[PDB]
């Protein structure tokens, strides 16, 4: 143990803490619940702030004050009694509380299951009666004495029962003679005979009273005797009256106690080895539910056995006291005090302890003392985890006191909530504003804010200059803002990058690092190309400027997190510096071609020359400055500075017309010429219409073939030109440009005739309510289609409202249809369509009812957006939990396996139609095998990147499979290797060897979730990763052959006709609401099915498909079934992220047969460690434990990590932490969540030793010079 806490943490071991340690930490028994002398305001002796124990409240000063300097340190004034030392030992030292009667820590009793309940094998609701002093329990018994003496003892029991019988027949004779004298008095004189018989009946009732008393006494005696016979430990003598009548007889033959000391006595008289051997026997032999319970007990039993613990530590003998500073009593200015709410709990425990002590010393009747011990138990239980059992202890306002179980900082409860962190310094936020004059790697910054971030830096830099004699004057000078401080601030801000968060930080680009440059105002001017990454419009959103301090921190912020180096999304490798809303329109207008426009190439000789050619883009621009050429008129320039397209290049030049100073003529616009001057020199000419898809393709080509520092500059140039030509576009929205389709009336009237006849048919009763609703719905969908068609054919192609949309800049055609035309159908609040329906475009204005119907859909949309953005965060948190420890650790594992990707399946006519979703499964991978052509030459060999050229080469060679490496088959035990991970989507190169690819995958999967509009949506994805059994479960086959189908009462009746065959798989309880799979056409009876063909429509649960078709098919199913969702919402997520996730799901195996190798059947363990155990056990005699793959959901996988330090922060912190204690499970600190918590540098990025221990010295040749 290294308690001094300096940089050395190889492990961080937990363990249940016995009293012999608890009273070894403590520096003195606190034994008075006194907090502060009301008037002097000093700590009381022996109180919960006692300086004598916890330490001195004043630096180097005793309590009596007889020592007040560092020269007296380490010594203790023998009158006051305080170690004269620094005043922060009140932050470290602890005190204990010597209890008078032991206690059960509540974490080991009330938790479910209750670990005490297991280690003793007791029913928890019969353990609570034991410890809370509600019912006795026999703790020991002298089996041999009760055995041998039992003859005489039952002899005296018989004698006692016969004395019972003597009293019985004594009563019998008494009532008999009394009632016989009653008859002798009845018949001796004459009267109503019924009175005499009433006398007989009363006598007989009293005699049956006698027999009833005798029967009850015999019953009680038999009860006590049977209990004494069956007496044995762990019995509950409820009602205590059997115990009361019992103890006096045979008290010397056993011991029966109550409460926590009784549990202590049991655990003392308890052999763990014998108990565990009993459990091993039962699990070996006993079947049924008994084996389940035996396993569940064997868990904690082997826990205590294997470790060097002892269950005696569970009953708490001495409570420890948290240091006084961690529960301070500070005074707000003005006499008020602010306690820590633990002081009240401690006062309760100390008071009840002292009262118990004085009661025992006094000698008190058993009832009061038991009540006191129960109060003590409840008090310590409230101290540890408040209101766990009972009603939480409350203060004023009926707010439950906040006990120790709640002060744990992370402390996730059953549901994973956000951490929310530490509130760093050197921070600051503001509102942002677009900064269209900045370079890509810059940030606006309010000087009045930079002057406060950098204040230490500027203080230093202007004390170095002789502007201020000291530091103090410079601080005050900044406080006054004397004029030259600004000129210093510039020099301090030079080259010093600052970060820019934007909560919520969905994905890795939320933080970027710019070069700060000063700006007037008070708004952080942001560069407009990064708003797509931040998801940040300028509707008032606010950003946060952190600041990097250390030299290494500046290096990280400069090289890793700079803006111009992060162009491509890490999710799917697409670019996000790409131009958008304004600049897209700008370049679209700039590059389009308007035939019939000013000064075109109009070749017609005989009456004049061509009059279209322009001797160079220089002359063309001169012309366009005059009013001769339009920017977009098709012309024929004679360029000498732009590499022509491929075809003309090959034609005129052949090899390579090295552009530089050549010549050639291409008929384009001037606009396209100015555009292709934006792009670099070497890049070919474009000569198209710069639609948004085209610009994305161009930037992909650039970023994948040029250096990043050129991609950034080209993006910035495209931005500038885009805005500048956006303004000259004239995209304005005047209501004289929302042209209504001139024949809307007739279309509406036609479909109204249709729907009207439908409604009249309903009035005829020919079709019911739901029928008429569906008919009207279909009619109005048809009408909306017709209206949209007419509308699109009516707008000219330069209409602003349609120019914006067609250019891909923003907004789909539905929104233009709603501006002019028809709103169509509006959703009901429930989800169904309103059969009204809305019939007016917003240009026409609606009617009252129309608007009121629209409001349903609007508010439902907003509310679902809120819930969806709240649930996406939940999913992301689970994913970062699962895959936080998947970091690249080797340049290559050198395996040979790896999945095979589709890659443009063959066409029937005979061709290679490119598969639609190749860009995410095929691109950015490393081949396992060698792509061969014609069964001949090798077209692409092992270990290449599969970018554009080689994918194209394969589609040319005509091959449609490539076995490519992937994290599903990377063999490195400690996370993935690199080449199996393929290219990192962000850089474009091979992923480096620290990338926390687990976290990147989790982020990229849970980022676009907020866009997941919708089982068919985000809950589908979530129940997929959790791996529950979906609601629309469809059974999968288990062997091929035609199907044994049947349609029974009110639902189907399916059975499998095997082909071997065998026991035909019977699927009886199906739902009529489910359907047959239409595949290959729809299924019918007698249809030959595959092995694992999905029978019904819906979703096959991954468990069943795992059990059927190995781990391969379940992986291929999970990846594809998530990609189905993320495609349906139109989103790109490269598959390797989902693969890195799933590879965590499929880590463990179940243990169906332990063999004889230290494994609990039905338990879960690692595949690698399972293999290691069998590798060991094949030597020293074989008992290979029967293992099976398990597909366990993300949550259970995360919770069953190796590092308790991490596993405790995920879910049920208390439960995970307590049984991590019982196992005494040492952590090794290899993950990220551990190092981040304890301040140690994270093992990833630049934390690994390959990069963290570099040596750096000037090369000898330069050392010689200077």
């Amino acid at each position: 143990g290294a308690m001094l806490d300096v940089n050395f943490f190889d492990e961080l071991r937990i363990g249940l803490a016995t009293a012999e340690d608890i009273r070894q930490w403590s520096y003195g028994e606190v034994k008075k619940p006194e907090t502060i002398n009301y008037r002097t305001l000093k700590p009381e002796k022996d109180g919960l702030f006692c300086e004598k124990i916890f330490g001195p409240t004043r630096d180097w000063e005793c309590y009596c004050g007889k020592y007040k300097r560092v020269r007296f340190k380490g010594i203790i004034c023998e009158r006051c009694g305080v170690e004269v030392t620094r005043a922060k030992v009140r932050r470290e030292r602890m005190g204990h509380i010597e209890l008078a009667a032991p206690v059960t820590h509540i974490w080991y009793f009330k938790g479910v299951p209750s670990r005490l309940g297991y280690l003793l094998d007791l029913a928890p609701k019969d353990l609570e009666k034991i410890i809370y002093f509600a019912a006795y329990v026999i703790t020991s018994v002298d089996e041999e004495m009760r055995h041998n003496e039992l003859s005489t003892l039952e002899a005296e029991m018989a004698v006692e029962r016969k004395a019972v019988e003597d009293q019985r027949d004594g009563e019998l004779e008494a009532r008999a003679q009394k009632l016989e004298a009653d008859l002798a008095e009845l018949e001796a004189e004459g009267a109503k005979a019924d009175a005499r018989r009433k006398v007989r009946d009363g006598g007989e009732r009293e005699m049956r009273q006698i027999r009833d008393r005798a029967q009850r006494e015999l019953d009680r005696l038999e009860d006590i005797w049977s209990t004494f016979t069956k007496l044995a430990p762990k019995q509950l003598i409820v009602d205590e009256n059997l115990y009361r009548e019992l103890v006096d007889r045979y008290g010397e033959y056993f011991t029966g106690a109550m409460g926590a000391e009784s549990i202590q006595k049991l655990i003392e008289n308890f052999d763990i080895d014998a108990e565990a051997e009993s459990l091993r026997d039962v699990i070996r032999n006993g079947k049924g539910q008994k084996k389940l319970r035996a396993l569940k007990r064997l868990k904690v039993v082997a826990a205590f056995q294997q470790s060097g613990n002892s269950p005696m530590g569970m009953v708490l003998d001495a409570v420890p006291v948290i240091p006084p500073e961690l529960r301070p009593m500070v005074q707000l200015d003005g006499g008020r005090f602010a306690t820590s709410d633990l002081n009240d709990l401690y006062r309760r425990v100390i008071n009840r302890n002292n009262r118990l002590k004085r009661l025992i010393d006094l000698g008190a009747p058993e009832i009061i003392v038991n009540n006191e011990k129960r109060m003590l138990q409840e008090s310590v239980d409230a101290l540890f985890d408040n209101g766990r059992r009972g009603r939480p202890v409350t203060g004023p306002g009926n707010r439950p006191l906040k006990s120790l179980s709640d002060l744990l900082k992370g402390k996730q409860g059953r549901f994973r909530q956000n951490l929310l962190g530490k509130r760093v310094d050197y921070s600051g936020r503001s509102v942002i504003v677009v900064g269209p004059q900045l370079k890509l790697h810059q940030c606006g910054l309010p000087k009045l804010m930079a002057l406060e971030l950098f204040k230490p830096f500027v203080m230093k830099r202007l004390v170095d200059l002789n502007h201020a004699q000291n530091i103090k004057s410079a601080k005050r000078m900044v406080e006054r803002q004397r004029p030259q401080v600004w000129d210093v601030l510039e020099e301090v801000i030079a080259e010093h990058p600052v970060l820019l968060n934007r909560a919520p930080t969905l994905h890795r680009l939320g933080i970027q690092a710019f070069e700060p440059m000063l700006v007037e105002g008070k708004a952080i001017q942001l560069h407009p190309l990064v708003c797509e990454a931040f998801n940040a419009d300028f509707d008032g959103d606010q950003m946060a400027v952190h600041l990097p301090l250390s030299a290494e921190a500046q290096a990280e912020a400069r090289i890793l997190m700079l803006s111009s180096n992060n162009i491509l999304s890490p999710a799917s490798g697409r670019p996000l510096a790409m131009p958008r809303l304004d600049m897209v329109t700008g370049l679209y207008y700039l590059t389009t071609e308007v035939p019939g426009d000013t000064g075109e190439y109009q070749p017609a000789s005989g009456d004049h020359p061509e009059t279209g050619v322009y001797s160079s883009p220089a002359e063309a621009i001169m012309a366009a400055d005059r009013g001769v050429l339009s920017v977009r008129a098709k012309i024929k320039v004679r360029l000498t500075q732009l590499r022509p397209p491929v075809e003309i290049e090959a034609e005129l030049f052949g090899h390579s017309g090295w552009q530089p100073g050549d010549a050639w003529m291409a008929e384009t616009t001037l606009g396209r010429v100015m555009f292709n001057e934006l792009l670099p020199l070497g890049y070919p000419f474009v000569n198209k219409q710069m639609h948004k898809k085209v610009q994305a393709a161009i930037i992909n080509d650039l970023a994948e073939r040029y250096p990043m520092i050129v991609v950034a500059q080209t993006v910035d140039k495209l931005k500038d030109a885009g805005f500048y030509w956006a303004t000259r576009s004239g995209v304005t929205v005047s209501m004289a440009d929302v042209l209504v389709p001139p024949r809307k009336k007739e279309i509406l009237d036609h479909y109204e005739e249709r729907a009207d006849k439908v409604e009249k048919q309903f009035q005829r009763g020919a079709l019911n309510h739901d029928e008429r609703n569906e008919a009207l719905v279909e009619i109005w969908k048809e009408a909306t289609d017709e209206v949209g068609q007419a509308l699109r054919e009516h707008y000219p192609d330069d209409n602003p409202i349609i120019t914006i949309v067609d250019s891909g800049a923003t907004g789909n055609f539905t929104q233009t249809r709603t501006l002019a035309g028809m709103k169509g159908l509006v959703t009901n609040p429930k989800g169904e369509f309103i059969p009204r329906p809305v019939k007016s475009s917003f240009r026409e204005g609606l009617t009252v009812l129309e608007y009121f119907i629209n409001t349903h859909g609007a508010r439902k949309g907003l509310a679902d957006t809120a819930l969806r953005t709240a649930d996406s965060g939940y999913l992301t948190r689970r994913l970062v939990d699962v895959s936080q420890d998947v970091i690249v650790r080797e340049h290559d594992c050198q395996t040979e396996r790896g999945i095979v990707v589709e890659l443009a399946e063959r066409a029937p006519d005979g061709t290679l139609i490119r598969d639609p979703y190749i860009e995410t499964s095929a691109y950015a991978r490393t081949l396992g095998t060698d792509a061969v052509d014609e069964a001949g030459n090798v077209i692409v060999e092992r270990g290449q990147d599969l970018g554009d050229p080689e994918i194209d080469a394969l589609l040319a060679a005509g091959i449609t499979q490539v076995k490519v490496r992937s994290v599903l088959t990377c063999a490195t035990s400690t996370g993935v290797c690199a080449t199996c991970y393929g290219r990192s989507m962000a850089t474009g190169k091979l992923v480096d060897i620290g990338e926390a690819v687990g976290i990147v995958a989790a982020q990229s999967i849970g980022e676009p979730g907020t866009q997941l509009t919708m089982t068919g949506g985000l809950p589908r994805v979530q129940e997929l990763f959790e791996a529950r059994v979906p609601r629309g479960k469809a059974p999968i086959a288990d062997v091929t052959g035609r199907v044994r189908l049947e349609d029974g009462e009110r639902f189907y009746k399916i059975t499998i006709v095997p082909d071997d065959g065998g026991e035909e798989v019977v699927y009886d309880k199906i739902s009529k609401r489910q359907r047959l799979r239409v595949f290959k056409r729809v299924l019918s009876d007698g249809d030959h099915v595959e092995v694992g063909q999905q029978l019904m429509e819906g979703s096959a649960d991954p468990h069943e498909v795992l059990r059927v078709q190995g781990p391969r098919e379940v992986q291929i199913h999970l990846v594809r079934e998530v990609q189905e969702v993320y495609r349906a919402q139109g989103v790109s997520i490269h598959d390797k992220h989902i693969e890195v996730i799933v590879r965590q799901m499929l880590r463990r195996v179940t243990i169906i047969d332990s063999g004889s190798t230290e494994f609990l059947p039905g338990s879960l363990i690692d595949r690698a460690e399972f293999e290691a155990e069998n590798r060991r056990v094949v030597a020293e005699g074989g008992e290979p434990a029967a293992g099976r793959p398990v597909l366990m959901g993300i949550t259970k996988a995360s919770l069953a990590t190796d590092s308790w330090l991490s596993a405790a922060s995920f879910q049920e912190t208390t439960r995970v932490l307590t049984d991590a204690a019982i196992n005494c499970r040492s952590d090794k600190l290899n993950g990220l969540k551990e190092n981040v918590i304890i301040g140690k540098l994270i093992p990833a990025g630049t934390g690994i030793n390959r990069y963290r221990n570099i040596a750096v010295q000037p090369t000898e040749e330069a050392r010689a010079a200077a």
Binding site: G1, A2, M3, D5, F8, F9, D10, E11, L12, R13, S1226
Partner: peptide, 4 residues
């Protein structure tokens, strides 16, 4: 804590 355990150093080594």
């Amino acid at each position: 804590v355990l150093s080594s």
